[PDB]
Design a binder for this molecule. Structure first.
Ligand SMILES: CC(=O)N[C@@H]1[C@@H](O)[C@H](O[C@@H]2O[C@H](CO)[C@@H](O[C@@H]3O[C@H](CO)[C@@H](O)[C@H](O)[C@H]3NC(C)=O)[C@H](O)[C@H]2NC(C)=O)[C@@H](CO)O[C@H]1O
Ligand code: NA
Length: 129
């Protein structure tokens, strides 16, 4: 499913991402926009052999199990396919775990390079939130 900007903003807020670990909702919408283009089915292979899954491109080296990343952890205890559902619940629970692991949202390269320090509030503009 390709979310609309405000549809994803409302889903993320309902799942408690608004202000989680101090990151305002616009940060999460911006991160998803540039990580997956709001596409829950986005998958992207890394050169180290891990894969990024879902709307927030969660990596299989550390967070989910996809069975093809030798030496990988599954700290969110979840199949990576569960991060692709039209329901973003699982991706959000795992992102909460990720952002609390030590480097915050710098875990998302697109967030660090494209969202960090910018006017992320623009991303929730117009949403009936
Ligand atoms: C959204 C996503 O999946 N992003 C991936 C990143 O999570 C990943 O970065 C590496 O993540 C692990 C887990 O967060 C980092 O480990 C932690 O390191 C810090 C110190 O920097 C320490 O506090 C923690 O103890 C330690 N946790 C564990 C469980 O060991 C690791 O350092 C991150 N690497 C870098 C370069 O920042 C990267 C790389 O796999 O991929 C993203 O896609
Ligand atoms: Na794994």
């Amino acid at each position: 499913k390709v979310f609309g900007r405000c549809e994803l903003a409302a889903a993320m807020k309902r799942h408690g991402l608004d202000n989680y670990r101090g990151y305002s909702l616009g940060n999460w919408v911006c991160a998803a926009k540039f990580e997956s283009n709001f596409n829950t089915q986005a998958t992207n292979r890394n050169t180290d052999g891990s894969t990024d899954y879902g709307i927030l491109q969660i990596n299989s080296r550390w967070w989910c199990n996809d069975g093809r990343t030798p030496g990988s952890r599954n700290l969110c205890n979840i199949p990576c396919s569960a991060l692709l559902s039209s329901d973003i619940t699982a991706s959000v629970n795992c992102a909460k775990k990720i952002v609390s692991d030590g480097n915050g949202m710098n875990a998302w390269v697109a967030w660090r390079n494209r969202c960090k320090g910018t006017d992320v509030q623009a991303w929730i503009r117009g949403c009936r939130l």
